[model samples]
Target: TRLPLPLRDTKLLSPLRDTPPPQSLMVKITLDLLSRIPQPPGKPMGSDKQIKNGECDKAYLDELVELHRRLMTLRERHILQQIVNLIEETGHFHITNTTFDFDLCSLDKTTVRKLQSYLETSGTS
Candidate 1:
């Protein structure tokens, strides 16, 4: 925790705001690249026999649902790691960190496991 906590609040914007790239600029590009992965495979499913057999467009939908999950995970982890970087770089980790710890309040398992790693590797990173 450093001095001028409130003052630095506005200051944090410059790194994000003054940058030439848009906020989503980085996010969008990577999403574009990653979105290309895990594309719909095989042809459209519209066969009655396929449906009766319990495997048809249902499989495609399930594939997409799972595909979407991976993409979402990729997006969140990427954004979150960078957010951690920003807080650390701006020296607000101490303040936000305790604030973050309280967020331990299902993130319960996800949050706990994540914080546990951070606790173990605290300053080592």
Candidate 2:
């Protein structure tokens, strides 16, 4: 899926200040988009009725768990690749943008709190 650019302030290209778009925001968007990909066909539960009727065997259970592990690995790889691609493609945005006045540690306090929260939820920090 695609999304419009989040920060549009051309003046944001100034020196590090108190209102630049956080790196966390970019990472979050990357993660969220990667996660929205649809599951591959035949993977959805209940898609295989035959498996439903048979007594649940250890082999089948193991295969099911393996599938789940593969799915997670695939998703993680996709997320990393996409995020890196996006960051490279949009490097101009970050390179040209400003940074906040408060450094990371000082950020535990005021208005920057929201940006910090976004970063936390986005799993960047």
Candidate 3:
């Protein structure tokens, strides 16, 4: 029997799962909020600059954190085409050494089931 909640090596897709299950059953958007931050062009500091500045104020960091959170929310809500644009800009990757190119029909159901299984086993409540 499967455990109540599955565990995984990475918890990246949990946030995406929190959103309603996709209407397109095959596609699951892999958006990791922590991994992506929109800071370079408009922020007071980027990662390198922050290192050089050698100081961090909680208020500044808090503001940026909220900004980043809102940025993701805006993208998901208003501009989904921008996401497809990203995949086109970034190209595709491989699965276990087999190259996989993303397109309109790129979502893998088997992979989705595996991930859902992992989440079902991992949920705390």
Q: For all the candidates, what are their Cα RMSDs to the real structure?
A: 20.8, 23.0, 19.4
Q: Rank the candidates by TM-score, best first.
A: 3, 2, 1
Cα lDDT for residue 125, candidate 1: 50
Worst 10 residues of 2 by lDDT: 93-102
TM-score of each predicted structure versus truth:
0.17, 0.20, 0.21
Pairs that collide, model 3: 5-121, 5-122, 6-121, 6-122
What C-alpha lDDT values do all the predictions have?
0.32, 0.33, 0.36
Order by lDDT, highest first: 3, 2, 1
lDDT of 3: 0.36
**Number of backbone-clashing residue pairs for each candidate, in the order shown:** 1, 4, 4
The sequence of per-residue lDDT tens digits that candidate 3 reaches over residues 13-104 is: 64565556233212233344223322222344423332233223355445334433433334333233443444444333222222222322
Q: What is the lDDT of candidate 1?
A: 0.32
Query: Ten-residue segment with the worst summed lDDT in candidate 1?
Result: 21-30
- Error of model 2, residue 72, in angstroms: 0.7
Candidate with the larger TM-score of 1 and 2? 2
1 or 3, which is superior by lDDT?
A: 3
Off by over 4 Å in 1: 1-75, 95-125
Write model 1 residue lDDT over 37-80, tens digit each, in one string: 22222465454442223223334344334432343344334444
User: Which runs in model 2 stand beyond 4 Å of their true positions?
Assistant: 1-31, 35-52, 75-125
Positional deviation of residue 96's Cα in model 3 after best superposition, in angstroms: 15
lDDT measured at residue 95 in model 1 versus the true structure, 0 to 100: 29
